[PDB]
């Protein structure tokens, strides 16, 4: 019997990205070698199988710093973090391999799928 | 130059509602007289002008319990909290006045607008 506001989910995501920009209520730092990225644990868990596993673990849920595998590319992580908060993926010939490898590690299935398709089209 | 995943924002919201259902990483209790509602501060701020003002205040941002005005109807609040996490508003003849009054207090402009329109259609 409900009515639905079509734009509500995108409006919520836009506001969560505005909170991230202003560093409001961010509760974790993701460290990717020499780079640091502040974020909201809930958004990360909502977008990534890896973060869902980390922040549901009874010990790791309480950490304020998470260090990723040294093989992870910071630019690839940055592109994926932007996608989590905006639905837009900045996929380019020069970053697709790093984005795909990062999305595989983060367990972001739809991103991995589009990367595979864009690579297949070139070869 | 980005590509966009159409369903991403709705998928994020669905996962945030699943976290709320399972009481995962909820960080505030909203008290509406005899009722309590657990939620995520970020989602509340993303949906309500009142919660945005509360959780950006340097003292109130740190409270784990927020008590609403005693005039606020718990069912109306519950319906609006469900709308925040799902984009679906359970508006009925028997609850529209309480939902509209609650949405005015919470500063949820689009909800107030649809309530006004449904009331105008009856009178």
């Amino acid at each position: 019997s409900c009515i639905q506001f079509t734009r509500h989910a995108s409006d919520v995501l836009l506001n969560l990205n505005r909170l991230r920009s202003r560093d409001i209520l961010t509760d974790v730092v993701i460290v990717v070698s020499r780079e640091q990225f502040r974020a909201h644990k809930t958004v990360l868990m909502a977008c990534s199988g890896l973060f869902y596993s980390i922040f549901t673990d009874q010990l790791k849920c309480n950490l304020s710093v998470i260090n990723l595998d040294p093989e992870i590319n910071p630019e690839g992580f940055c592109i994926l973090l932007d996608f989590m908060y905006t639905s837009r993926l900045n996929l380019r010939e020069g970053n697709i391999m790093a984005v795909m490898a990062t999305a595989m590690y983060l367990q972001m299935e739809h991103v991995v799928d589009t990367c595979r398709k864009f690579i297949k089209a070139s070869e | 130059s980005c590509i966009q995943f159409t369903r991403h924002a709705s998928d994020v919201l669905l996962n945030l509602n699943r976290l709320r259902s399972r009481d995962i990483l909820t960080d505030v209790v909203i008290v509406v007289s005899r009722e309590q509602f657990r939620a995520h501060k970020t989602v509340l701020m993303a949906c309500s002008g009142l919660f945005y003002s509360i959780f950006t205040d340097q003292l109130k941002c740190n409270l784990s319990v927020i008590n609403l005005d005693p005039e606020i109807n718990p069912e109306g609040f519950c319906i609006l909290l469900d709308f925040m996490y799902t984009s679906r508003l359970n508006l009925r003849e028997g609850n529209i006045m309480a939902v509209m009054a609650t949405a005015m207090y919470l500063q949820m402009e689009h909800v107030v607008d649809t309530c006004r329109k449904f009331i105008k259609a009856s009178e």
């Binding site: 409900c2 009515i3 639905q4 506001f5 079509t6 734009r7 | 679906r88 508003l89 689009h110 649809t114």
Partner: peptide, 5 residues
């Protein structure tokens, strides 16, 4: 906006 879902 509002629609019947």
């Amino acid at each position: 906006a509002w629609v019947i879902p």
